[PDB]
Structures are given as C-alpha cells and as structure tokens.
C-alpha cells in the first residue's frame, strides 16, 4: 500500500482570457488544414497556441512577463509564407512574435495613441490599428516577415476606437466610444482616401455613456453587426448606412461577436455570460434579409471576453473564453443542440512545480517568484523573489538539492541552497555563460553537470560549452508554415542518456559523453510526454492521441509495445485529456506512472493487456498491473517522494447574478 500526500497549498492561477484567433480562414468545402492552430491571449502577457487535432493539445506557449497583457490577437496566413501572429499589449506597440523562438520578432510603434483594436484586411497585406485618440493607422506587412511600415492615417476623430473590421480591403469599419459606428475608405486609387463616408449612431443610454465594443462585417448580406454596452445587437445596411434590425438581447455589455462562413449565424457574447445565436438560415429570411433570435445559452460562470469561430469539412468549432480563464467549445451548426466541453483551467503540458525526493522539497515557480516547501506537515522553508520582469520558463533542482537552476529565455541564473535552521540560505552562483544563455529546457545530469537546450535549439553541457551534435531535420511545407514544430519540445536526461522530442515528432537518442546523435523515432503525432527507463533500457513516448510507445535503446520498440499500443485499456482511449507527465516507480522499475490534468494511471510493462465531435475528424495528416484513478483533479504535478510515498498537487471573481428559479 502507498502513501498519498494531497497538496493544495501550491496555488497557480491562470490569467484571464482576453483574445482568441484562428490561424486559417474557414472553408467548409475544403478539408481542415494540418497547420490550423488557435492563439489564446492572456492578461499576464502569455500567448498560447493550441492544435484542434487529436482532441485539443497545446503545441507551444509564449511566456509573458510583469505588468504586460494581451488585448488583441491577429493571424496573417500568406501562401508560401510562415504563419504570422500579431498582438497588441494595450500600449502604442504592435508586437510581431517569432513563432520559431517565441520571442518578439519586431516591435512597431503606431506613432499614435494607445492601441485598443487590431484587425487585418482580407488580402492579409494590411493591418488596421485603433487608437484611443480616435486615429486609425494603416500598416503595411506585405514587404515580408519582420517588415512593418506605416501606410496611411485615416480621418481623425475624437472618440476612442474600440474595434475595427474590414470589407475586403476597401473600407474600414470601426466602433467608437462615443456610441457611433464609423466607416472609412481604404480604397487605393480613390479620391475618397481616408475619408469618413458615413456615421451611424446607436441608441444611447440616458444615464451612462454608450460604447460600441464590437463590430463585424457580413459579406453575404453586406451588413454590419454591432454590439453595444446597452446589450443591443444591431444589423445595419452597409450601402445605405441605415439600421435594418435592432435586438435588446443581452442584459449587459456585448463585448465580442462572431459569425459563420456562410453568414447564416451571428454569435454574440459578453458580460452577462450568455451566448446569443442569431439565425438567417431559412430561405424566406434570406429573401427578406431578416435575422431571428434563435436561442441563447449560459455556459460561462463569468464574463465572456472573446469568442471565435472556425469551420471546415471536418471542423465545426465555436470557441469562447474570458474571465473564467477556461475555454468553452461548441458546434456552430448545433450550438443549440450540440454538446459542449469546458476546458480544464490548467493542463500542465509544461510543469510549473517539481518535487525533490531527497530533502522532501517541493518547489513551485510563478511570475518570477520561486517558493520551496519542505514536508515531513508542510513548511515553507524559503521564498525567492527575482528582479527581472520576464516570467520563469523552467526551474531545475540538483540530485543533491543544493544547486537550483532558474531558466528564462532572456537569462539563466543558478542559485545554491544551504539548509540552515530549518530554512534554506540562497546564494547566487555567478556563471557568465548561463546569464547570457537562453534556456528553453534545462536538466541535471548529476549534482554538478546540466544540459541546456537554448531557444535556438543548441544543446550543450555546463559543468557549473560542450555542444552536442544534433541530427538535421528535413524541411517540410508544414514546417515552413509553422516553424516551431521542428523545434525541440521535450528534453530528458536519464543516466547520461539524453532524448529530445520535436513538435514534428522527431525522437533522437543523444549520448552526452560522446555528444553524438542517433535517430530513434519520428512520430507523426505531437509528442506529449517522454520517459527513459534504464532498467528496461527503453524510452517511453506518448503522442497527442494517447498511444504509448516503448523504445529499446540500441529491433527498437519493446515487445510490450506491440501487444499493448493498440490494446490499451478503455480508460486510456476514452480520455479527452492527453498525458503530460511520466515518472517511474521506485519499488519496481518496470511499473510506470502516467498522469494527465485530471487523471493518474499506472501500467505494468511486463504484462500484456487482455485483447478481447468537438475535434477535427483528422481525415488529413498531422503535417502536410493496471491502475487508473480520476478521484484527484485538477493535478498541477504528480511524482513520488519515497518508495512508498506519492505526492499529488492540486489547485484549490465577481460575476453576473442570473437567478436559478427554484420551486
């Protein structure tokens, strides 16, 4: 029997979702592209990229820092070019992010007021930028990646621009803080350059200011859908700049809007936590050009900041998020009738907590602050505060526990810990190379030597640089489109044997003394967890589809692998959450522990098993003895303290009052 130390004293709180953006334009006729991804903006400055294939797995995370946020996200997908992401931090800068490294490729100043809204034209060669001073700035991007140029300033006005939308590339539609919708001409070779063709005023609340939070253009019906602080949804005739229909649907501000590919449905959401579906699907409605308030649904416990829509032959996704810090996913065609998923608030694809078997130390790092606890019942031995604004990416603790390595993309710092008076004394060991070194992943060979994978994927050994050779990866159209798939995702060091997994699935065995690379595996699904077992002389690899693969180190894949890879128990297959962490069992080496965000599993690798909707159907390619428990959830981190002790770490705002009638 085994000992469980259930821990909730470690608290990690996700930042509120602020923006959402898909990387491709919906095409119902065509199949879902392999490169489709979802970008998620967070109030802490973090940007998260997710893949809608194989349920939903998070391919890469861009780390934010102190006193920074994301308020608008925008994709540009030019044929033959890498996928391009842009973000606005609430200040007078448009940030271009290097997806390969996750660092800011370019920072461009709008030469205007603070940015409130960002939008791209259909040709994807121009960005429209909304400013608080009422200026809308047009920026060129067609020059190339990393190229941001000032094109034109539209007609100036005195109201803050809260949102922006495009009609092809001719006109810019903007909602303003004065309760007026404004249209400008971006037609080139036109005398009406930058002029305000029409002005539309919404119904204005008598006792409070009226704000147009969201506006969207509807190509099929050449209409504008606008959301306003009064809770009104208004449909406007584009050519005549006149109100067609008005609906008092929401009880609070409508913060965001979205529509389907055919413009048969408009989905509104915002403060009142409800999603209202507006339908024009019926033929008679289409002839009459009249919308219908089809239905509404309450799915979020707090404000819905962002909603986005994607559709294809194999995809039908309505994704929403907000202050609740969780994703809610729906089917546009069956929003009223379809089932929904509430995404877990934290899925530890990247672990923010580590457990040290020796000294019984638990270490958690969050927002440049590192806390270490000791447990015999738990005491906070020491708390470390780091000056630099950039959040900590990874922290690694030595097998003696004396040496703690803190890694950030900007810098890597090493701190020695000495136990004095049931407390840890912190002394920063000075290593110039580490300070100037970017650290995507760091691991300990022993109490002294470490392996660091740079943001450029340069693997080297530092004794406390001995670079390690790495096999070249053939370029692919998917790799060009999404750069980071070819980047190293997981780095594990186990008794001198180092295994690196890339997002494209490339698994290679690296010998650290020899510093030579030998190819092991190249999986066609994203790799979610890796483990090396010296006793069985095998490496365990888990893909996004939750299939388990155990590779002998040189006939590669252990005989258990065949008999059990496709013969996994029903629990493993039924999981819609992918495995993220693997750790061995001290008592028996063959047994291995596997856990996800909400589940923990143990599998004996010496025993063969008895043979006996809201995700992409996956018709297209990704590129181009048994114990199962779900009692413990959500799980930040799980590992063993001793041979008979298991450590489980778990997680422990004012919202709208929508009364639940009870009789």
């Amino acid at each position: 029997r085994m000992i469980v130390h259930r821990c909730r004293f470690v608290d990690f709180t996700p930042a509120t979702i602020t923006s959402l953006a898909f990387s491709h334009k919906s095409n119902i006729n065509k199949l879902t592209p392999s490169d489709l991804r979802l970008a998620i903006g967070r109030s802490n400055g973090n940007i998260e990229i997710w893949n809608p294939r194989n349920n939903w797995f998070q391919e890469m995370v861009i780390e934010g820092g102190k006193d920074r946020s994301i308020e608008g996200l925008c994709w540009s997908n030019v044929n033959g070019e890498s996928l391009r992401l842009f973000s606005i931090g609430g200040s007078t800068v448009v940030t271009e992010w290097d997806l390969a490294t996750g660092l800011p490729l370019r920072n461009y100043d709008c030469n205007s007021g603070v940015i409130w809204s960002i939008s791209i034209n259909d040709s994807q060669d121009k960005l429209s930028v909304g400013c608080d001073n009422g200026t809308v700035v047009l920026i060129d991007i067609s020059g190339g990646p990393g190229v941001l140029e000032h094109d034109t300033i539209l007609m100036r006005q005195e109201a803050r621009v809260l949102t922006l939308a495009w009609k092809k590339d001719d006109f810019v539609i903007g909602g303003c803080s004065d309760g007026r919708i404004r249209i400008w001409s971006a037609q080139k070779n036109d005398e009406n350059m930058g002029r305000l063709l029409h002005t539309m005023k919404v119904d204005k609340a008598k006792k409070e200011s009226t704000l147009v939070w969201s506006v969207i253009y509807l190509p099929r019906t050449d209409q504008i859908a606008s959301g306003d602080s009064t809770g009104s949804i208004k449909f406007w005739d584009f050519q005549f700049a006149t109100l067609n229909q008005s609906f008092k649907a929401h009880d609070a501000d409508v913060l965001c809007l979205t529509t389907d590919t055919d413009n048969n449905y408009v989905f509104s959401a915002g403060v009142d936590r409800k999603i209202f579906q507006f339908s024009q699907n019926t033929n008679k409605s289409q002839k009459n050009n009249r919308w219908v308030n089809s239905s509404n649904r309450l799915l979020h416990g707090n404000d819905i900041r962002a909603i986005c829509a994607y559709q294809s032959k194999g995809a039908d996704f309505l994704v929403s998020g907000g202050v609740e810090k969780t994703l809610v996913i729906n089917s546009l065609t069956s929003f009223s009738n379809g089932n929904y998923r509430k995404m877990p608030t934290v899925e530890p694809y990247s672990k923010n907590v580590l457990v040290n078997k020796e000294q019984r130390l638990v270490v958690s790092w969050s927002e440049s602050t590192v806390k270490i606890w000791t447990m015999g019942n738990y005491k906070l031995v020491c708390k470390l505060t780091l000056k630099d604004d950039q959040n900590i990416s990874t922290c690694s603790l030595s097998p003696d526990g004396q040496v703690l390595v803190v890694g950030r993309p900007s810098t890597t710092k090493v701190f020695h810990l000495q136990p004095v008076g049931n407390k840890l004394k912190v002394t920063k060991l000075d290593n110039d190379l580490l300070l100037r070194t970017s650290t995507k992943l760091v691991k300990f060979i022993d109490n002294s030597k470490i392996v660091i994978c740079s943001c450029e994927d340069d693997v080297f050994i530092v004794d406390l640089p001995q670079e390690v050779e790495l096999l070249e990866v053939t370029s692919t159209k998917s790799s060009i489109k999404v750069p980071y798939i070819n980047r190293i995702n997981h780095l594990e060091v186990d008794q001198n044997i180092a295994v690196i997994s890339r997002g494209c699935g490339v698994v290679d065995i690296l010998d650290l003394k020899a510093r030579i690379s030998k190819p092991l595996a190249r999986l066609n699904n994203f790799i979610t967890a890796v483990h090396i077992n010296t006793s069985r002389k095998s490496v365990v690899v888990i893909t996004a589809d939750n299939k388990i693969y155990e590779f002998n180190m040189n006939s590669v894949l252990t005989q258990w692998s065949k008999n059990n890879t496709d013969n996994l128990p029903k629990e493993w297959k039924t999981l819609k959450e992918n495995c993220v962490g693997i750790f061995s069992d001290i008592e028996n080496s063959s047994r291995l522990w596997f856990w996800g965000a909400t589940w923990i599993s143990r599998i004996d690798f010496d025993v063969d098993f008895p043979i006996n909707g809201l995700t992409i159907t996956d018709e297209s390619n990704f590129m181009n003895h048994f114990f199962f428990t779900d009692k413990y959830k959500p799980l930040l981190f799980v590992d063993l303290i001793s041979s008979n002790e298991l450590a489980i770490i778990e997680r422990n705002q004012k919202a709208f009052i929508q009364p639940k009638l009870v009789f």
Binding site: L380, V381, C382, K383, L384, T385, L386, K387, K423, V426, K428
Partner: peptide, 14 residues
C-alpha cells in the same frame, strides 16, 4: 512569509 522571504534586490544591495 517574511521570515522565509528572500529578495534579490535587497540581496544585491547588501
């Protein structure tokens, strides 16, 4: 927490 808190800026200063 102040007993076990460590501040880098104060440590850097002295």
């Amino acid at each position: 927490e102040d007993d076990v808190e460590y501040n880098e800026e104060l440590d850097d200063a002295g």
